[PDB]
Each structure stands twice: as structure tokens, then as C-alpha cells.
């Protein structure tokens, strides 16, 4: 609308994206350190052997 609610309700939806995109972009550097351990564990044998 032209009302003040319409200017306010965008911010509820726009800042909803900004909190949501940081989760997905923040997920990927986790997934680097996640998938590096699963390969290094399959590379690494235990000590006593």
C-alpha cells in the first residue's frame, strides 16, 4: 500500500531473507570442515597398528 504498515512489512520480509541467507552461506564452510574430517578419517589408520 502507500501506508506505513506497507513500508514496515517489507522489513519483516527483507530481514527475514538476510537471516535466512546467512544460514545457507554459513552452512558451506561448515561443510568444508565436515567433509574434510570424513576423508581424513578414511585416510588415517590407528596408532598401535
Amino acid at each position: 500500500d502507500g501506508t506505513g504498515i506497507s513500508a514496515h512489512r517489507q522489513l519483516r520480509a527483507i530481514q527475514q531473507l538476510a537471516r535466512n541467507v546467512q544460514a545457507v552461506l554459513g552452512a558451506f564452510e561448515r561443510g568444508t570442515a565436515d567433509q574434510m574430517l570424513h576423508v581424513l578419517l578414511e585416510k588415517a589408520p590407528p596408532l598401535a597398528l
Binding site: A7, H8, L11, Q15
Partner: protein
Amino acid sequence: EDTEADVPVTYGEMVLNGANLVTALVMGKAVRSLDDVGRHLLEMQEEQL
């Protein structure tokens, strides 16, 4: 290790006076920081955050 500790002196604070007092008498709902919560929503209504 140390025998002295710097501790704050002013003990409060909450002030019901101002535009917060109007919401108490009239509406019966009052936010503690509404003196400046209604401020920041107007600049958040403008440019990127």
C-alpha cells in the same frame, strides 16, 4: 591474585516518564525502551542495514 575490583556505582535504571507514560495510562501496554524503539524503526524503514 588481586584484592581490588572495579564495580559500577549507579544502580538502576528505568524511567517511566516521557512518551512511555502515555502508553501506561492510556493503552495499558508499555515497552521499556519505546522512547528509542520507535526511533530506530523509522531509520530502518530507510536504507540498507
